[PDB]
Ligand binder design. Structure first.
Ligand SMILES: [Ca+2]
Length: 223
């Protein structure tokens, strides 16, 4: 997260870290056994870390649970990042409490202008790199489809939304992928891609979660 703030401890209780030796992606807890993330975050071995604030220090509220099932969207396109969504089934259910909690799926798509919260442990610099210990937070609005397509001509499918600021300076970045965009208590976006980070007229591009509610519910019910 570039240009954000350090979140208060466990104030984003659905935020998880995907770890394969080190933190490499975010994700969101949507029921006690299932995490949603980005398909391009796929690895064949994944430990999900819940209840994290400082990812470099054991603080006492963590739960480390291995991924048992790892299911990418069947129409994921690795060239365009279309359908950039993935479901992880935990090998045992997380214990839900005030610091480890689920986030609701969207009841409808978010309108342009809707204010959201983006979070993660990704890069905090738009030039160079700095990876933080503490979870970072950013308030940002959903952008119109026409604005998003103008920012990225010929790249924004009907399964993508832009969230952020055309003036740049505030954005998600590498290491945030798979993490949440939550608006009015609903997971509307998954950190997916962009051109650089916090660049002018290049807001972050996010998987449009409201298109996948049916796929998510059916996959969970069937597995
Ligand atoms: Ca920790």
């Amino acid at each position: 997260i570039v240009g954000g703030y350090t979140c208060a401890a466990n104030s984003i209780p659905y935020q998880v870290s995907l770890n394969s030796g080190s933190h490499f992606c975010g994700g969101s807890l949507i029921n006690s056994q299932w995490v949603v993330s980005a398909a391009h975050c796929y690895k064949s071995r994944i430990q999900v870390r819940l209840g994290e604030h400082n990812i470099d220090v054991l603080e006492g509220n963590e739960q480390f649970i291995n991924a048992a099932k790892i299911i990418t969207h069947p129409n994921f396109n690795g060239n365009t990042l279309d359908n950039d969504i993935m479901l992880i089934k935990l090998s045992s259910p997380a214990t839900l409490n005030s610091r480890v909690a689920t986030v609701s799926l969207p009841r409808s798509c978010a309108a342009a202008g809707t204010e959201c919260l983006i979070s993660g442990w990704g890069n905090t610099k738009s030039s160079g790199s700095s990876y933080p210990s503490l979870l970072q937070c950013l308030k940002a609005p959903v952008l119109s489809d026409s604005s998003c397509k103008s920012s990225y001509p010929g790249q924004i499918t009907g399964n993508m939304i832009c969230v952020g600021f055309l003036e740049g300076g505030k954005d998600s970045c590498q290491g945030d992928s798979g993490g949440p965009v939550v608006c009015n208590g609903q997971l509307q976006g998954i950190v997916s891609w962009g051109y650089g980070c916090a660049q002018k007229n290049k807001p972050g591009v996010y998987t449009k979660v409201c298109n996948y509610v049916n796929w998510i519910q059916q996959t969970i019910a069937a597995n």
